[PDB]
Design a binder for these strands. Sequence first.
DNA 1: GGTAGACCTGG
DNA 2: AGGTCTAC
Length: 313
Amino acid sequence: MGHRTLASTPALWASIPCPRSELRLDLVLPSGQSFRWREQSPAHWSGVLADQVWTLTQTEEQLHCTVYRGDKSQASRPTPDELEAVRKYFQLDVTLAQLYHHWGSVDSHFQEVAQKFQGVRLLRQDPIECLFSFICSSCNNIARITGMVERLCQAFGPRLIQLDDVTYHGFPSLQALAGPEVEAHLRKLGLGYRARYVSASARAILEEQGGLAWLQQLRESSYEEAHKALCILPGVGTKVADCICLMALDKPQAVPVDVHMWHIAQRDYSWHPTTSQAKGPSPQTNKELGNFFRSLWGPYAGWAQAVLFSADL
DNA sequence: GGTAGACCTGG
DNA sequence: AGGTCTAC
Ligand SMILES: [Ca+2]
Ligand SMILES: [Ca+2]
Ligand SMILES: [Ca+2]
Ligand SMILES: [Ca+2]
């Protein structure tokens, strides 16, 4: 049959209690957090989650999930253990109603816009996927990032299943990305200079930093200590490190600063740098702007940012 | 020690 | 969407 819909094969879906006010798929899944989610049917989002493929759709009160067991298994509704993977991914224990309240309390501007854009939360992503996706994000549009990431997974990622005319692949290992002649191969896939960064970082982690554990144990480390460590890797500067911290390493206070931020900082908040004499973006001033919004929104500043970014782009 | 080049490209 | 490395 291939890609399932809620109407098409109703016995195969299981529901996770979640109102649209807590999660809007259409606002989080395509919004440049993950690049590997596709809306194959209208309102149905298919992607790879915990090394299986899932199709997600939502009604007013429920989030509907189905998982694609292969030719190995018979068709089954998602198990409670399987569904806890989905819950974990979307970090539903974090309650947006409460966060939106707190942000709207201490920021009148937020109140105005966040009323229109609810359900904008942050995914908890695998650090590897996240790192390499955002290494490729340098000087890059979401569309081209999406293609680069997709091509990279087809090339070096294990085959999961085929639905319709789409072959879902897992995100590649450090071993695959550290393999010989990978950079050359990735250039043929049009990553450009990012090809060198992918290979160099995969090798840097495996051969110098002590492997996958190093990257994963940056979850337990502080935001300060995790950011310093990521920046050692080739291709990883301040902005990429903040993205990884915020989307993979459980640092909600991380505020990745780009010119989009500055536009928002000036238009909406009328913000000027005080410490640095420089009036434009720099290492000093971006450090301020991150601190400013952490001061303004507090520990979940990064999540609050996402509501504003999802309002514009 | 904050700034102006090169790096890839789809344009 | 447009950041990271290198250079003085
Ligand atoms: Ca994995
Ligand atoms: Ca199953
Ligand atoms: Ca794929
Ligand atoms: Ca670096």
